[PDB]
Amino acid sequence: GLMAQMATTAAGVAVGSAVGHVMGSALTGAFSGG
Amino acid sequence: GLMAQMATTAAGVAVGSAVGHVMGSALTGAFSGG
Amino acid sequence: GLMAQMATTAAGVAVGSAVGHVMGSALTGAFSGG
Amino acid sequence: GLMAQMATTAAGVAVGSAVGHVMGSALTGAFSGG
Amino acid sequence: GLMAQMATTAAGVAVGSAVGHVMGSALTGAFSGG
Amino acid sequence: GLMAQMATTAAGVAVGSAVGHVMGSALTGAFSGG
Amino acid sequence: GLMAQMATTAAGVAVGSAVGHVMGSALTGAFSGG
Amino acid sequence: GLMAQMATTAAGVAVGSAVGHVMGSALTGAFSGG
Amino acid sequence: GLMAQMATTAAGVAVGSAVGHVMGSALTGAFSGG
Amino acid sequence: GLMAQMATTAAGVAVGSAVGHVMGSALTGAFSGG
Amino acid sequence: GLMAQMATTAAGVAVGSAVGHVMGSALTGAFSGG
Amino acid sequence: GLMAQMATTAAGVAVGSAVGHVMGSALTGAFSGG
Amino acid sequence: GLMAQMATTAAGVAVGSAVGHVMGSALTGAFSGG
Amino acid sequence: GLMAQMATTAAGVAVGSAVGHVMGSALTGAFSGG
Amino acid sequence: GLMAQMATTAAGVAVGSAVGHVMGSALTGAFSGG
Amino acid sequence: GLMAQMATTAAGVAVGSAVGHVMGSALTGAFSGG
Amino acid sequence: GLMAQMATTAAGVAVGSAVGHVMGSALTGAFSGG
Amino acid sequence: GLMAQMATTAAGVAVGSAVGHVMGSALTGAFSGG
């Protein structure tokens, strides 16, 4: 049962590149601004 | 049972590129601005 | 039972490119602005 | 039982390109603005 | 039982291109603006 | 039992192109603006 | 039992092109504006 | 038992082109404006 | 038992072209404006 | 000298709705398929 | 010198609705298929 | 000399909705497929 | 000399919604597929 | 001489929504696929 | 001479939303795939 | 001579949201894949 | 002569959000993949 | 002659958020993969 994640980025000029990977995780977040 | 995720990005000039991958995850989020 | 996801993006000039992948996940989100 | 998702984008000038992939997922969202 | 989804986009100048793919998913959403 | 979905878009100048694919999914949505 | 869906769009200048595909899905929606 | 759907659109200048495909689906919608 | 649907549209200048395809579906809709 | 254009569309289930508006414009298009 | 254009469409189930508006415009189109 | 364009769309379930607006513009497009 | 463009879209479930606005612009596009 | 462009989109579940705005611009694009 | 552009998007579940704004710009793009 | 651009996006669950703004710019891009 | 650009994004769960702003710039990009 | 750029992002759970700002710049980029 192979599980994989890939992400290739290649730019001449990159301003603000971002990559995020999540696998088999349990993320909990809350925002209460104000 | 192979499971895969791929994402290739290639730009001459990229301003604000973003990539997000989620696999087998349980994400919970809340927003309460104000 | 192979499961796959792919996304290829290639631009001369990209302003605000975005890619999102979700597989076998349970995402819960709430918005309460105001 | 192969399941696949693909998306290829190629632009000379792209302003605001977006790609979203969902497979075997259970997304729940709510909006309550105001 | 092969199941597939594809989407190819190619523009000289694209302003606001978008692609969305859903397969074997259960999305629930609500809007309550006001 | 092959099931497939395809969508090819090619424009010299595209302003607001959109593509949406749904296969074997159960989407529930509600709108309550006002 | 092959089931397929295709959509090809090609324009010199496209302003507001849209494509939607649904196959083997159960979409439920409600509108209650006002 | 092959089932297929196709739609080809090709315009010099298209303002507001739209394509919708439904196959083997059960769509339920309601409108209650006012 | 082949079942097929096709629609080809080709215009020099198209303002508001639309195509809709339904096959083996059960669509239910209601309008209650006012 | 007020000039106005309006278009209201409201459907319980719409498959392939399209709207196009042109005002004070000079659109030139050509088709040469084949 | 008020000039106006209106179009209201309201259907329980609409498959392929289209609306096009032109005002004070000069559209030129050509078709040469074959 | 007020000039305006409006378009309101409201559907319980919309598959492939599109809106295009052009005002005071000079669009030139060509198609040469084949 | 006020010039305005508006477009409101509100759907319970929208698959492939698109909006395009052009005002005081000169768009030139060409398609040469094949 | 006020010039404005607006676009409001609000969906319970949106798959592939797109918005494009152009004002006082000169976009030139070419497609030469093949 | 006020010139403005706005775009508001609000969805319970959005998969592939995109927004693009251009004002007073001169974008040139070319596609030569193949 | 005020010139402005705005874009507000608010989703319960957004997968692949993108925003691009261009004002008073001269973007040149080329694609030569293959 | 005030010139401004704004972009607000607020999501309960965002996977791959992207924002790009360009003002008074001259971006040149080229893609030559292959 | 005030010139400004803003971008606010607020998410309960963000996977791959990106922001890019360019003002009064001359970016040149080239891609030659292969």
Author numbering:
A (entry chain R), B (entry chain P), C (entry chain N), D (entry chain F), E (entry chain D), F (entry chain B), ...: 43 to 76
What does the published report state?
Here, we demonstrate that the low complexity N-terminal domains of both D10 and D2, as well as the full-length proteins, can form amyloid fibrils in vitro and in vivo. Structures of D10 and D2 fibrils assembled in vitro from the low complexity N-terminal domains of each protein show that their core comprises the most highly conserved region between the two proteins.
Using cryo-EM, we observed several distinct D10-NT fibril polymorphs (see Methods section on Cryo-EM sample preparation and data collection) and determined three different structures. Polymorph-2, solved to 2.70 Å resolution, also contains two identical symmetry-related PFs, with a fold (PF2) distinct from that found in polymorph-1 (PF1). PF2 is comprised of residues G43–G76 and exhibits four strands consisting of residues M45–A53 (similar to strand-1 in PF1), V55–V57 (similar to strand-2 in PF1), A60–V64 and L69–F73. An extensive inter-PF2 interface is comprised of strands 2–4.
